[PDB]
Amino acid sequence: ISTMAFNLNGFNFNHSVIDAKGNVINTWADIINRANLGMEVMHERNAHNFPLDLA
Amino acid sequence: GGRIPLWIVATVAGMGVIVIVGLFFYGAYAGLGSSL
Amino acid sequence: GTFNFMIVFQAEHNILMHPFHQLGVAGVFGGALFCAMHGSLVTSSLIRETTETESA
Amino acid sequence: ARRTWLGDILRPLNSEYGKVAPGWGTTPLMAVFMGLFLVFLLIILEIYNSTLILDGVNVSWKA
Amino acid sequence: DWRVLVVLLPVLLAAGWAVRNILPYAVKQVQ
Amino acid sequence: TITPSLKGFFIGLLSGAVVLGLTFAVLIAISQIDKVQR
Amino acid sequence: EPNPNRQPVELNRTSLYLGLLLILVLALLFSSYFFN
Amino acid sequence: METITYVFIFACIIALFFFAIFFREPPRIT
Amino acid sequence: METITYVFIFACIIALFFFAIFFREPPRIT
Amino acid sequence: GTTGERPFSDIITSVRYWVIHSITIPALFIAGWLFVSTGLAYDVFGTPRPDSYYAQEQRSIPLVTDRFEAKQQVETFLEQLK
Amino acid sequence: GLPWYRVHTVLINDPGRLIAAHLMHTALVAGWAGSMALYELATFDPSDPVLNPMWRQGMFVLPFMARLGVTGSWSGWSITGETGIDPGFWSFEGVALAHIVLSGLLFLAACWHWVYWDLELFRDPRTGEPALDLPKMFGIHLFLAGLLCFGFGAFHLTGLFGPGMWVSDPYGLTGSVQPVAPEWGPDGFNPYNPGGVVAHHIAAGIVGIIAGLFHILVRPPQRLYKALRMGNIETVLSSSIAAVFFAAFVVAGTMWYGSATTPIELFGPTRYQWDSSYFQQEINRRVQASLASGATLEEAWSAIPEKLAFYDYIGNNPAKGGLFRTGPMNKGDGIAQAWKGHAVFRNKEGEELFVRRMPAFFESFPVILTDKNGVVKADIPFRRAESKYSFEQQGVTVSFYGGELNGQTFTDPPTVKSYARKAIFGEIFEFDTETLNSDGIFRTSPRGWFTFAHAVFALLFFFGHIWHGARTLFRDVFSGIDPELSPEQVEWGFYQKVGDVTTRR
Amino acid sequence: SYPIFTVRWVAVHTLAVPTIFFLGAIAAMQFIQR
Amino acid sequence: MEVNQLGLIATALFVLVPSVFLIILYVQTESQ
Amino acid sequence: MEVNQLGLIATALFVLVPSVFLIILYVQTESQQ
Amino acid sequence: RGWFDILDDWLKRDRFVFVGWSGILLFPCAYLALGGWLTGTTFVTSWYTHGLASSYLEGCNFLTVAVSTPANSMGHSLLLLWGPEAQGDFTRWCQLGGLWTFIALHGAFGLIGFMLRQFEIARLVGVRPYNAIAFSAPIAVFVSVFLIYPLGQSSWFFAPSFGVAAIFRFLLFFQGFHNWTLNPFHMMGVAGVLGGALLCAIHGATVENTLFQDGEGASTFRAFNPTQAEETYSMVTANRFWSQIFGIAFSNKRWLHFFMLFVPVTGLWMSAIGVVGLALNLRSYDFISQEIRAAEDPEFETFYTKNLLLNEGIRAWMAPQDQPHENFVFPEEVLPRGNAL
Ligand code: CLA
Ligand code: CLA
Ligand code: CLA
Ligand code: CLA
Ligand code: CLA
Ligand SMILES: CC1=C(/C=C/C(C)=C/C=C/C(C)=C/C=C/C=C(C)/C=C/C=C(C)/C=C/C2=C(C)CCCC2(C)C)C(C)(C)CCC1
Ligand SMILES: CC1=CCCC(C)(C)C1/C=C/C(C)=C/C=C/C(C)=C/C=C/C=C(C)/C=C/C=C(C)/C=C/C1=C(C)CCCC1(C)C
Ligand code: OEX
Ligand SMILES: [Cl-]
């Protein structure tokens, strides 16, 4: 918690597997990320005016 | 039984894993699964 | 409020994918496991000092 | 201890405390039954699971 | 096909080399 | 009448019996050689 | 003709304290769900 | 009524704490 | 709920009767 | 106490031990390498290679949608790749 | 003294008072059945077996009476909605009474056996100690269960001497109590074939009769008597608990999945009927048929019974509830009054659209309408600024066929939206939310509560089996391990076989 | 005078021989290009 | 707040009954 | 009937509190002799 | 000596790895659950069941590999290799998810075997079987979560897949669909796990910091002989420290180690009950009174309502990809989102 306080965050494997053409081949990390994204865009729903939630 | 001293086999073994693991971390950046 | 904090933390930092929180889960699961183990093992080897009608 | 009419009548049914057949007695025969029952439970479950499908057996409300 | 063979190859070698090397001390195991 | 999955059922029934058989064959055989002493 | 199997039962003070704490904390926990 | 109830139970626990500390079975060396 | 309450209490009284009669302190002489 | 077997400190320091296992361990390693370098692991387990996840112009996933037509569904999808 | 958690172990060497305790438990259970049934009679509304059946009103024991043939009340109604019936004594009221009387008789027998606890029957003639020949008792009790089980199958279920059992069609429309002939074929093992239930009890009954004969006549082998501590009554508890949780898991299972003994008219539908659109398919069959014989849309949808429409409604899905959402289903969505009719949505181009239905997993779900092919064509948007599929843009309407609204069509968007929000739940009904002050939140059915309780009790009783199983087999060390026990026993190598002192060196 | 083939023996080789095979397999995977 | 008014009695008996049970056992313990 | 909701809790406590008091004193009386 | 008694002798021999009768169940089922997990995370995909890569072979790493659950369309099929779905075809068995049932069921039976082993060894050695009784809690968890929960749902698909990040996904599914954090049965479980870890640490540190001086070295580990009679630490000084620091202390060593058993064992059992509930979607999802108020009063907001808005995000954003067999299509415009994000 004390170092994620300084935004050194968990491993990121979003779109980490791709096929010969380059389609994204989802893994379980991408499914986690779909959940994270639901949390992200709903929390404090009236508090953000600009598109990145930088703190 | 006890011709090769234990400390030697320890170092050998250890440097053995270190290599295999090192390779797996290399592979995290090369080829399949590197996002590239 | 605590749940709120954990959910927002997961979205903002992917704490589940962080090794230190994985270490923390091994810490507390393993604490519980070893807690139950030690309690059960010492309890299993209590010396017969009582009858079956009184608390061991 | 109190004797009663009904007790006296029932007494023999509760008289062979501790009597046993020597050694292993009917154990092998019991194991055959257990083993048969198991294969029979297996058949029942696999029909309910539709792992085993049998002709004429439609595991649907439309039976 | 041909790969069922090459994959097993080193495994089979490895089995002879151990079996020929411990064959004597093995035969003792006999009481 | 006999269906494909019933033949499956028998296949696995016999596969399982054979696995059980070997195990105790092996085990009884060993335990008769490598015997405890009193 | 009194029954020879009768036994006296015990609960010491420490067990009362633990037991009361258990009940009170269970109540504080479930009460919200009972009121819903 | 619901507020009163939660506060009552909390209040009983605090009183339990007091007796369990100050009015415990004293440990002795048998 | 009020019906259940009334009959419940009445039922307790009848049970009490039973114990008061058949499980009384038996009077003993002198 | 001693359950009767040969101590491990004793076996791994023994030369006879390494005579045998200087061969077998690398051999197993190389078997496993071969298992993948021959492409054999792909066909045993049915794992897509990098070029066989999708057909060239498809973006949908070959999801099995039937219990008993299931092994057939996979086969028919493996044909649409060629 | 005894710890609070061991109080009832004073009965272990007291067969008479054990029986007394067992009688009192029996009286309590019977008293409960009696009491529960009276409560259900006082609260049940019999007036509508179509839209307000028992399983909408939180009835738990009423369906078990119905299942085996009790269907009418001394007040003249039956659960099949037939008036002017004379059920004789075995109405719901008389079953409840008989369980109260029974409870009271058992209360009395428990007092006698508690007081006259020292009957000579319980004392081993040999040694004079309290003793129970459990092997012989099991034979007796098994023989008796076999006979009850046979007779229940041969007379009650067949209807030779008794009422039969609840049977219905595949869609729960015409249920009633009917004699059932046994199915001796392999379809007897189909949980959805009621004849299998008859056959089961006849064949198992006989087998129980014969097994009990064997267990009365032939003693257990010494090997099995020692290994299972057959002179210790805790062994019987351990194995009895094991069979109970096995039984409880099977009954949770068949309740959740559907069997011939858990019918949907008594317990409501299963969650799997919603998942597979089991009722929607059948409704559509009957409509397509009607339109094949020249009926109008209004005529074909007007011909669907309300009872069948009501099954195609997620509010009756048992997996839509919550753990502290208490009471009857009618306290959630309300008391169903009428089918409103089948809602047909069309966009501006006349093409018919289909609301995507709510899956059980979702407490809430968006409103998305697709065409026959699953292309999204309309939706209720969240962000409005870049919305391209809104009802206003796409000009969607709703027209009703059948039910209350047959022939009506709505074009104002706010109204089309509210009917689309309900179509995610399936067919749309009129509800009385006032009588019970219903809060609008789905509850589960008796199929739900039953399954939950029994799954939970089965799991807990596994723990009881482990607990009493261990106490039987380790009774010698319950109070603790032997104080004069040495490392040669527990350390390695001293012995060739663990535990066996005779294997020195 | 110890045995060389024991139950313990079977136990280590049921584990260790597949382990090395698997490792060589996983090693080779680090050189698969897409 | 539109709470369940059977919650008050469920909570109250949930506390009272088991607590009384404990108290009864403890007091009869202290007097023997 | 439209009846005072608190009547139930009142009745239960009215019964329960004084009854438990009496039982407590009786049981610890029997544990003496 | 009959053949049974001779086989008994050989199975209960004092060897480096005790076998026993229990072993005939334990060692094959555990090796195969283990082996099937390794085999599947190393080589097997989830492409046809889930639309996901799941093996080292495909380029997954240790956190993202899984043996994944079979497709929803298999229902609760046992997925036997010789069953009607795979028809004996090993390759097709893997592709359809059969390793998941292979692992699930052999592990179920291996856990049985492990508990019987605890019983078998306790009996021969002569100790009370409290460790076996303690292992009941892991078994309750395993059965509730991996077996009962999917049997209540539509299929094995919704059980947990065997992987690090697959299990994380399971956690978040449980938050977004079941509001599992609000469930009192999970809350008791948390308490028993966290209090178990607390008991673990405080008992260890207490003993280590009340040791008697039994040798003259600075490494105090050498001053202990397992055959000694004496307590190696002071219960009396431990008790005084904690009475004065925290107000109460253990005084009874037996009660203290029984409590260490009880607390975590009882926590896991409670959590298992809750999951049986969720098998039926019988959730503690809402508080009706909060919802009646919130619906009518748009200024009423609590952390309860805030958390539901997050659940609503998780469901809509994750369902299409997490349940691909539903063919969920959510236009951009229906996706719930706050401002800007
Ligand atoms: C022709 C003769 C005949 C006929 C037609 C039947 C017909 C039937 N028998 Mg009967 N039976 C007969 C003779 C017959 N029997 C005889 C002679 C005996 C021996 C005396 C039995 C003994 C018997 C038993 C013991 C059982 C039946 C059951 C059944 C029913 C099976 C359908 C069903 O719902 O299964 C549903 C049941 C199953 C599919 C069995 C489930 C198996 C599970 C997996 C066992 C293990 C549970 C495990 C420990 C917990 C897992 C935990 C986790 C997964 C949650 C059906 C009515 C079963 C029943 O009552 O169903 C209600 C049952 O339990 N029969
Ligand atoms: C004296 C006879 C008698 C009769 C005719 C009834 C009749 C009835 N009871 Mg009542 N009851 C009785 C005694 C009786 N009861 C007693 C003594 C008690 C106290 C225990 C109760 C307690 C009671 C309750 C608690 C409830 C009823 C209910 C009911 C109704 C449904 C019954 C049902 O589904 O049972 C089904 C019974 C079973 C499914 C048990 C099956 C046995 C299992 C499978 C055990 C198998 C083990 C066996 C030994 C192995 C056999 C071996 C084999 C080879 C042969 C019905 C009107 C229900 C009701 O509606 O109440 C209003 C209800 O909920 N009863
Ligand atoms: C097999 C048991 C069983 C089942 C399945 C049902 C099922 C049903 N009953 Mg019935 N009931 C039963 C037993 C049962 N009842 C008994 C024994 C009684 C006597 C008290 C009643 C009295 C009764 C009444 C008075 C009513 C019902 C009603 C109902 C319905 C709604 C139930 C509800 O809202 O649940 C609510 C259940 C819960 C909120 C579950 C609470 C569980 C909590 C968490 C307690 C356990 C926590 C525990 C202390 C944790 C400790 C852990 C510790 C070990 C560490 C439903 C059809 C209602 C209905 O609609 O009737 C028409 C109704 O009004 N029942
Ligand atoms: C047929 C079922 C059955 C029977 C007859 C017994 C009988 C017994 N148990 Mg076992 N037990 C059972 C099931 C059973 N148990 C199950 C299912 C479990 C798992 C939870 C256990 C776990 C267990 C343990 C851990 C222990 C026993 C002990 C005992 C003995 C003393 C019990 C006592 O004095 O309690 C006294 C109990 C009280 C004074 C109050 C308990 C209050 C409970 C928690 C709430 C009341 C529930 C309520 C009345 C409604 C009933 C619900 C209904 C669905 C069952 C006694 C021989 C003890 C023993 O071995 O002694 C040597 C012991 O240590 N039992
Ligand atoms: C302890 C040993 C053990 C156990 C309990 C299991 C258990 C299981 N295995 Mg595994 N398995 C094992 C060892 C074991 N296996 C070994 C050593 C291997 C390597 C070959 C495998 C390989 C394997 C595969 C490849 C698969 C399984 C599968 C299964 C499942 C289905 C089994 C089945 O249907 O059996 C049916 C057969 C029986 C139940 C045998 C019955 C034995 C006889 C015939 C009973 C009748 C006796 C007779 C009537 C009376 C005689 C009395 C007696 C005294 C002689 C089950 C979970 C399947 C699975 O996981 O799918 C999801 C699967 O596909 N197993
Ligand atoms: C004496 C007599 C009589 C009378 C009778 C009577 C009157 C009876 C009644 C009875 C009754 C009336 C009974 C009752 C019972 C009940 C019960 C027994 C209950 C129980 C319950 C419970 C146990 C619960 C639990 C719970 C809870 C509370 C919560 C939730 C969960 C549960 C469910 C767990 C007569 C005349 C006949 C005859 C003569 C004699
Ligand atoms: C990562 C790390 C950090 C700390 C230091 C340390 C050096 C320990 C370290 C190293 C760890 C490493 C990389 C570990 C790698 C180990 C591996 C991958 C283990 C592989 C073992 C695999 C095994 C047995 C597989 C056996 C499979 C079995 C029987 C198959 C059984 C079967 C299946 C599954 C299906 C049907 C057929 C059959 C035969 C029934
Ligand atoms: O406040 Mn609490 O939460 Ca950390 O990020 Mn930015 O800020 Mn707000 O958003 Mn996302
Ligand atoms: Cl901002």
mmCIF file with all atom_site columns, C-alpha atoms in Angstrom, chain J:
data_model
loop_
_atom_site.group_PDB
_atom_site.id
_atom_site.type_symbol
_atom_site.label_atom_id
_atom_site.label_alt_id
_atom_site.label_comp_id
_atom_site.label_asym_id
_atom_site.label_entity_id
_atom_site.label_seq_id
_atom_site.pdbx_PDB_ins_code
_atom_site.Cartn_x
_atom_site.Cartn_y
_atom_site.Cartn_z
_atom_site.occupancy
_atom_site.B_iso_or_equiv
_atom_site.pdbx_formal_charge
_atom_site.auth_seq_id
_atom_site.auth_comp_id
_atom_site.auth_asym_id
_atom_site.auth_atom_id
_atom_site.pdbx_PDB_model_num
ATOM 1  C CA . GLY J 1 1  ? 15.642  -41.661 14.160  1.00 0.00 ? 1  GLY J CA 1
ATOM 2  C CA . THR J 1 2  ? 16.535  -43.467 10.924  1.00 0.00 ? 2  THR J CA 1
ATOM 3  C CA . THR J 1 3  ? 13.858  -45.035 8.711   1.00 0.00 ? 3  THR J CA 1
ATOM 4  C CA . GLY J 1 4  ? 16.678  -47.019 7.047   1.00 0.00 ? 4  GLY J CA 1
ATOM 5  C CA . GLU J 1 5  ? 17.188  -45.401 3.621   1.00 0.00 ? 5  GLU J CA 1
ATOM 6  C CA . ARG J 1 6  ? 20.385  -43.904 2.174   1.00 0.00 ? 6  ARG J CA 1
ATOM 7  C CA . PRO J 1 7  ? 20.994  -40.293 3.305   1.00 0.00 ? 7  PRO J CA 1
ATOM 8  C CA . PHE J 1 8  ? 20.568  -37.609 0.633   1.00 0.00 ? 8  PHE J CA 1
ATOM 9  C CA . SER J 1 9  ? 23.689  -35.637 1.648   1.00 0.00 ? 9  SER J CA 1
ATOM 10 C CA . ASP J 1 10 ? 25.339  -38.986 0.919   1.00 0.00 ? 10 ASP J CA 1
ATOM 11 C CA . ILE J 1 11 ? 23.760  -39.692 -2.490  1.00 0.00 ? 11 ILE J CA 1
ATOM 12 C CA . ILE J 1 12 ? 24.169  -36.330 -4.215  1.00 0.00 ? 12 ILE J CA 1
ATOM 13 C CA . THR J 1 13 ? 27.796  -35.993 -3.173  1.00 0.00 ? 13 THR J CA 1
ATOM 14 C CA . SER J 1 14 ? 28.448  -39.497 -4.527  1.00 0.00 ? 14 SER J CA 1
ATOM 15 C CA . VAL J 1 15 ? 30.081  -39.839 -7.921  1.00 0.00 ? 15 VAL J CA 1
ATOM 16 C CA . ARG J 1 16 ? 27.967  -42.804 -8.955  1.00 0.00 ? 16 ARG J CA 1
ATOM 17 C CA . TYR J 1 17 ? 25.043  -40.456 -8.470  1.00 0.00 ? 17 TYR J CA 1
ATOM 18 C CA . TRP J 1 18 ? 26.438  -37.878 -10.866 1.00 0.00 ? 18 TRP J CA 1
ATOM 19 C CA . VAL J 1 19 ? 27.641  -40.414 -13.430 1.00 0.00 ? 19 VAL J CA 1
ATOM 20 C CA . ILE J 1 20 ? 23.978  -41.400 -13.755 1.00 0.00 ? 20 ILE J CA 1
ATOM 21 C CA . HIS J 1 21 ? 22.421  -37.960 -13.531 1.00 0.00 ? 21 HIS J CA 1
ATOM 22 C CA . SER J 1 22 ? 24.943  -35.987 -15.563 1.00 0.00 ? 22 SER J CA 1
ATOM 23 C CA . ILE J 1 23 ? 23.198  -37.842 -18.420 1.00 0.00 ? 23 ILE J CA 1
ATOM 24 C CA . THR J 1 24 ? 19.532  -38.286 -17.467 1.00 0.00 ? 24 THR J CA 1
ATOM 25 C CA . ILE J 1 25 ? 18.690  -34.744 -16.325 1.00 0.00 ? 25 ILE J CA 1
ATOM 26 C CA . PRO J 1 26 ? 19.997  -33.047 -19.509 1.00 0.00 ? 26 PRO J CA 1
ATOM 27 C CA . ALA J 1 27 ? 18.373  -35.811 -21.537 1.00 0.00 ? 27 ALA J CA 1
ATOM 28 C CA . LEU J 1 28 ? 14.951  -35.100 -19.993 1.00 0.00 ? 28 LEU J CA 1
ATOM 29 C CA . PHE J 1 29 ? 15.510  -31.405 -20.522 1.00 0.00 ? 29 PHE J CA 1
ATOM 30 C CA . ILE J 1 30 ? 16.254  -32.037 -24.173 1.00 0.00 ? 30 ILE J CA 1
ATOM 31 C CA . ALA J 1 31 ? 13.258  -34.348 -24.518 1.00 0.00 ? 31 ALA J CA 1
ATOM 32 C CA . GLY J 1 32 ? 11.080  -31.500 -23.241 1.00 0.00 ? 32 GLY J CA 1
ATOM 33 C CA . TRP J 1 33 ? 12.684  -28.952 -25.498 1.00 0.00 ? 33 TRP J CA 1
ATOM 34 C CA . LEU J 1 34 ? 12.125  -31.317 -28.408 1.00 0.00 ? 34 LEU J CA 1
ATOM 35 C CA . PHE J 1 35 ? 8.519   -31.811 -27.320 1.00 0.00 ? 35 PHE J CA 1
ATOM 36 C CA . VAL J 1 36 ? 7.913   -28.111 -28.049 1.00 0.00 ? 36 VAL J CA 1
ATOM 37 C CA . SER J 1 37 ? 10.477  -27.498 -30.826 1.00 0.00 ? 37 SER J CA 1
ATOM 38 C CA . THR J 1 38 ? 9.008   -30.328 -32.835 1.00 0.00 ? 38 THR J CA 1
ATOM 39 C CA . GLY J 1 39 ? 5.597   -28.651 -32.572 1.00 0.00 ? 39 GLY J CA 1
ATOM 40 C CA . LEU J 1 40 ? 4.390   -31.873 -31.048 1.00 0.00 ? 40 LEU J CA 1
ATOM 41 C CA . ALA J 1 41 ? 2.886   -30.224 -27.929 1.00 0.00 ? 41 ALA J CA 1
ATOM 42 C CA . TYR J 1 42 ? 0.513   -28.258 -30.159 1.00 0.00 ? 42 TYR J CA 1
ATOM 43 C CA . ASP J 1 43 ? -1.082  -31.322 -31.754 1.00 0.00 ? 43 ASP J CA 1
ATOM 44 C CA . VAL J 1 44 ? -1.288  -33.446 -28.580 1.00 0.00 ? 44 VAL J CA 1
ATOM 45 C CA . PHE J 1 45 ? -3.119  -30.783 -26.541 1.00 0.00 ? 45 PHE J CA 1
ATOM 46 C CA . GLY J 1 46 ? -4.930  -28.891 -29.302 1.00 0.00 ? 46 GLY J CA 1
ATOM 47 C CA . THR J 1 47 ? -3.344  -25.588 -28.437 1.00 0.00 ? 47 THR J CA 1
ATOM 48 C CA . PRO J 1 48 ? -3.490  -22.972 -31.207 1.00 0.00 ? 48 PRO J CA 1
ATOM 49 C CA . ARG J 1 49 ? -0.205  -21.854 -32.745 1.00 0.00 ? 49 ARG J CA 1
ATOM 50 C CA . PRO J 1 50 ? 0.146   -18.098 -33.230 1.00 0.00 ? 50 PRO J CA 1
ATOM 51 C CA . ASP J 1 51 ? -1.385  -18.334 -36.721 1.00 0.00 ? 51 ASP J CA 1
ATOM 52 C CA . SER J 1 52 ? -4.393  -20.499 -35.896 1.00 0.00 ? 52 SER J CA 1
ATOM 53 C CA . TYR J 1 53 ? -6.357  -18.483 -33.331 1.00 0.00 ? 53 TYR J CA 1
ATOM 54 C CA . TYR J 1 54 ? -8.493  -16.752 -35.976 1.00 0.00 ? 54 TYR J CA 1
ATOM 55 C CA . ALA J 1 55 ? -9.181  -17.096 -39.658 1.00 0.00 ? 55 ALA J CA 1
ATOM 56 C CA . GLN J 1 56 ? -7.564  -14.319 -41.613 1.00 0.00 ? 56 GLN J CA 1
ATOM 57 C CA . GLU J 1 57 ? -10.603 -12.052 -41.619 1.00 0.00 ? 57 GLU J CA 1
ATOM 58 C CA . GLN J 1 58 ? -12.613 -13.293 -38.636 1.00 0.00 ? 58 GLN J CA 1
ATOM 59 C CA . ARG J 1 59 ? -12.801 -11.464 -35.329 1.00 0.00 ? 59 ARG J CA 1
ATOM 60 C CA . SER J 1 60 ? -15.231 -13.783 -33.511 1.00 0.00 ? 60 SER J CA 1
ATOM 61 C CA . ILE J 1 61 ? -14.079 -16.564 -31.207 1.00 0.00 ? 61 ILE J CA 1
ATOM 62 C CA . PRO J 1 62 ? -14.625 -20.292 -31.906 1.00 0.00 ? 62 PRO J CA 1
ATOM 63 C CA . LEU J 1 63 ? -16.666 -20.739 -28.730 1.00 0.00 ? 63 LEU J CA 1
ATOM 64 C CA . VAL J 1 64 ? -18.236 -24.161 -28.225 1.00 0.00 ? 64 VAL J CA 1
ATOM 65 C CA . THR J 1 65 ? -22.010 -23.671 -27.927 1.00 0.00 ? 65 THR J CA 1
ATOM 66 C CA . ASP J 1 66 ? -23.368 -27.208 -27.686 1.00 0.00 ? 66 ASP J CA 1
ATOM 67 C CA . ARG J 1 67 ? -22.789 -29.956 -25.164 1.00 0.00 ? 67 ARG J CA 1
ATOM 68 C CA . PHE J 1 68 ? -23.039 -33.039 -27.389 1.00 0.00 ? 68 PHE J CA 1
ATOM 69 C CA . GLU J 1 69 ? -22.297 -31.485 -30.808 1.00 0.00 ? 69 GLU J CA 1
ATOM 70 C CA . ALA J 1 70 ? -19.235 -30.103 -29.111 1.00 0.00 ? 70 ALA J CA 1
ATOM 71 C CA . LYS J 1 71 ? -16.361 -32.200 -30.445 1.00 0.00 ? 71 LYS J CA 1
ATOM 72 C CA . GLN J 1 72 ? -17.864 -31.709 -33.919 1.00 0.00 ? 72 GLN J CA 1
ATOM 73 C CA . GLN J 1 73 ? -18.099 -27.931 -33.442 1.00 0.00 ? 73 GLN J CA 1
ATOM 74 C CA . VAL J 1 74 ? -14.348 -27.705 -32.751 1.00 0.00 ? 74 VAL J CA 1
ATOM 75 C CA . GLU J 1 75 ? -13.523 -29.797 -35.819 1.00 0.00 ? 75 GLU J CA 1
ATOM 76 C CA . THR J 1 76 ? -15.727 -27.703 -38.121 1.00 0.00 ? 76 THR J CA 1
ATOM 77 C CA . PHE J 1 77 ? -14.007 -24.555 -36.813 1.00 0.00 ? 77 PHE J CA 1
ATOM 78 C CA . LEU J 1 78 ? -10.560 -26.072 -37.444 1.00 0.00 ? 78 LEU J CA 1
ATOM 79 C CA . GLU J 1 79 ? -11.585 -26.535 -41.073 1.00 0.00 ? 79 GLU J CA 1
ATOM 80 C CA . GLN J 1 80 ? -12.561 -22.887 -41.636 1.00 0.00 ? 80 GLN J CA 1
ATOM 81 C CA . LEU J 1 81 ? -8.915  -21.958 -40.967 1.00 0.00 ? 81 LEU J CA 1
ATOM 82 C CA . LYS J 1 82 ? -7.592  -23.300 -44.299 1.00 0.00 ? 82 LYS J CA 1
#
